[PDB]
Amino acid sequence: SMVEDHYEMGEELGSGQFAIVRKCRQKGTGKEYAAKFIKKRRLSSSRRGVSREEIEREVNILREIRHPNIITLHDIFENKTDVVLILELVSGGELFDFLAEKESLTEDEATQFLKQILDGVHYLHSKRIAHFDLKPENIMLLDKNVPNPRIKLIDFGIAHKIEAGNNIFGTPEFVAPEIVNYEPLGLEADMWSIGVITYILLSGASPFLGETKQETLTNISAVNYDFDEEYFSNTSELAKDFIRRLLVKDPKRRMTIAQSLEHSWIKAIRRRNVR
Amino acid sequence: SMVEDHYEMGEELGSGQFAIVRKCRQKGTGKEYAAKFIKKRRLSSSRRGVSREEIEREVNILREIRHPNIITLHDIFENKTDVVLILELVSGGELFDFLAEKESLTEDEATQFLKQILDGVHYLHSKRIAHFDLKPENIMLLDKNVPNPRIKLIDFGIAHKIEAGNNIFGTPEFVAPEIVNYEPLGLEADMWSIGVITYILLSGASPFLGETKQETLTNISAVNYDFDEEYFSNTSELAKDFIRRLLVKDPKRRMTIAQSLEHSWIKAIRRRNVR
Ligand SMILES: CC[C@H](CO)Nc1ccc2ncc(-c3ccc(C(=O)O)cc3)n2n1
Ligand SMILES: CC[C@H](CO)Nc1ccc2ncc(-c3ccc(C(=O)O)cc3)n2n1
């Protein structure tokens, strides 16, 4: 009767700051799922756990989205301490793991993954949803032991709907400079992330990584990276152009998801990879 | 039975881009109110009218707030085209009108208004509410024909709750520069506005106003203003210090509402003004 009682919880799959993922089994069907336990914030004024509004944001996004390259939400329940998302079980690991094993990917291998990531982001962007945390750890594989693995985007923990929005009619005389210069975060941030994913897939090298977290942030802000000959000596001009057109400081000058899909590097006719 | 049928609408009081305000009378009590008609957006995808979410934001803020220097929401209804806010009727005009008649205010007159504005903003900020459109047009007087008029803050059309908020736990390696450098809009914007209000109350001069809207925006961003001797030759150093400590580009370096209330110019013992 209680939805919680319909799932038998099993072992931990992993953990983050705010959530623990456990394997589970639906009692009646025997089908397995991933159960993401999100620890609820206890008082509005607390700085721990996740607020009701932040949980609802993620769950509302997961409920709206349906695409082959995006994780599926199967069910949801809540108890005293947690809201539990019952998600499709995906058993081929993360793209992070796959890349770590291969060291780097060829351009044909990289584009087979990227086409899928681009399709999934195209879908999200069509619904005005910015994921805001695209990275290889948030891209799962259905089965890693095939030559062209299928992927699923996960972790909508900081995903947002982007409104079209700006008193544009009133006097600006009393408005603060941060408002005068306000530019909302939007879909372009995902495009930047896709450029970084592309770079790392081709090289195994992180383009902005510094010796300290502060150095990484400084490098990102300055767009301080290059195509080091250690990794890119034989990389195509088209692959470099794709990355350059995404790694742009000004969000308004980055390729859009539509432009990325029409880029020659992605359009290019290639063979599906053999084992 | 229908709430709408309990109010007899009268003449227009004023109009903006998105709203018309009419005088009205509650049929049973005979008491008069201001009725703000907010035109509803017709499709999510439309760029006209006001979205449900934007209406709810304003109405939820008005419902939470109760303070002598803040407008009171009395009732609400909705019809096919509009959501109608029934507000306390305030008949002494705007601070905008009052200043236009006086040309400029003395420091004693200015501080009598400012103490009230500061009290009202103190309250809003205590509830994590940024008004975001403070200006003399959004400050009404109960009665303009007294020496020390009482005021009410109005127009919560772009007011927002400010959360305390920032994947601070994950890698920043894939994060876009606009996210790395993201600073949310917050309570400091109101403090800037209060500095501009103060300046104009003392001089009748707008500090950043240019010949074109673009010039005004450029002046705001650059904090390009001075204390022109035409208006400020006899203004106190304390009044200038108060304004300087608010008109600061970096929001994090502006006086907070608590600091403003403890400033010597505001703390100073003064006589209530005579007629
Ligand atoms: C921390 C959990 C890690 C993720 O790679 N392990 C697994 C293992 C199998 C599996 N199957 C589905 C999922 C999963 C799917 C989605 C999320 C999410 O949207 O945050 C999290 C986990 N996961 N996660
Ligand atoms: C555009 C309407 C102007 C405002 O000064 N006239 C009046 C005249 C009397 C009066 N009494 C209350 C109000 C009023 C009060 C609040 C609002 C609001 O929160 O937007 C708007 C109007 N108003 N507004």
Side-chain angles (χ1 to χ4, degrees), chain A residues 9-14 20-24 33-37:
Chain A
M9 295 302 162
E11 70 271 20
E12 181 185 354
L13 293 170
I20 324 172
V21 179
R22 293 169 174 114
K23 198 181 295 165
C24 76
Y33 294 96
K36 184 184 186 182
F37 289 72

Side-chain angles (χ1 to χ4, degrees), chain A residues 197-212 214-245:
Chain A
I197 289 167
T198 304
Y199 185 106
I200 204 168
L201 285 178
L202 299 176
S203 62
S206 189
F208 300 106
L209 180 58
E211 275 189 297
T212 63
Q214 189 49 237
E215 283 175 56
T216 307
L217 301 178
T218 298
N219 292 337
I220 294 170
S221 192
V223 197
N224 183 33
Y225 80 102
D226 72 349
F227 293 110
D228 194 312
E229 287 286 294
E230 192 174 349
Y231 320 109
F232 293 92
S233 61
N234 293 321
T235 305
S236 76
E237 289 303 315
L238 277 169
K240 292 188 279 179
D241 186 65
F242 181 83
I243 292 168
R244 282 194 198 92
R245 285 178 63 187

Side-chain angles (χ1 to χ4, degrees), chain A residues 26-41 43-46 48-79 81-111 113-162 164-165 169-212 214-230:
Chain A
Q26 198 174 316
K27 280 178 192 169
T29 67
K31 188 147 146 267
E32 290 186 317
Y33 294 96
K36 184 184 186 182
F37 289 72
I38 307 173
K39 193 65 70 185
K40 288 186 277 181
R41 178 164 290 170
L43 292 171
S44 171
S45 37
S46 168
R48 306 189 170 175
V50 184
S51 75
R52 172 73 62 197
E53 179 171 55
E54 294 166 303
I55 296 179
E56 282 173 338
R57 179 184 285 117
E58 169 175 6
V59 167
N60 287 337
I61 286 168
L62 285 166
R63 280 181 176 145
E64 176 179 7
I65 60 190
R66 187 183 65 219
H67 186 274
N69 295 114
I70 298 176
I71 201 70
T72 299
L73 186 69
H74 173 75
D75 209 349
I76 186 158
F77 65 90
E78 172 176 350
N79 58 25
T81 53
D82 295 272
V83 175
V84 186
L85 284 41
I86 305 305
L87 293 140
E88 169 174 26
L89 185 70
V90 183
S91 303
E94 307 166 349
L95 185 49
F96 176 82
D97 305 311
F98 190 86
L99 176 65
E101 299 265 27
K102 305 265 281 177
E103 311 179 53
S104 62
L105 303 188
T106 67
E107 292 188 35
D108 282 2
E109 288 165 343
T111 53
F113 280 118
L114 288 162
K115 267 176 170 287
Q116 292 181 76
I117 295 161
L118 294 185
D119 282 345
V121 172
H122 181 272
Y123 175 86
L124 290 180
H125 290 190
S126 81
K127 292 187 163 293
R128 297 173 297 109
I129 295 161
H131 183 285
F132 286 139
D133 198 23
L134 295 174
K135 56 186 176 173
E137 295 176 78
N138 282 344
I139 294 164
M140 301 198 66
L141 282 59
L142 296 183
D143 179 352
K144 74 190 202 197
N145 304 123
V146 291
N148 310 295
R150 303 314 291 175
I151 65 87
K152 294 253 169 195
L153 306 181
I154 66 156
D155 196 358
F156 290 86
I158 66 171
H160 286 67
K161 282 266 193 185
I162 308 310
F169 200 70
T171 178
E173 284 166 271
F174 303 83
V175 177
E178 62 267 28
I179 292 177
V180 170
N181 296 135
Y182 180 63
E183 287 298 344
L185 302 177
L187 301 180
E188 312 92 341
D190 285 341
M191 300 315 305
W192 170 281
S193 295
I194 291 166
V196 177
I197 289 167
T198 304
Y199 185 106
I200 204 168
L201 285 178
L202 299 176
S203 62
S206 189
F208 300 106
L209 180 58
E211 275 189 297
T212 63
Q214 189 49 237
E215 283 175 56
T216 307
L217 301 178
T218 298
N219 292 337
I220 294 170
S221 192
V223 197
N224 183 33
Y225 80 102
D226 72 349
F227 293 110
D228 194 312
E229 287 286 294
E230 192 174 349

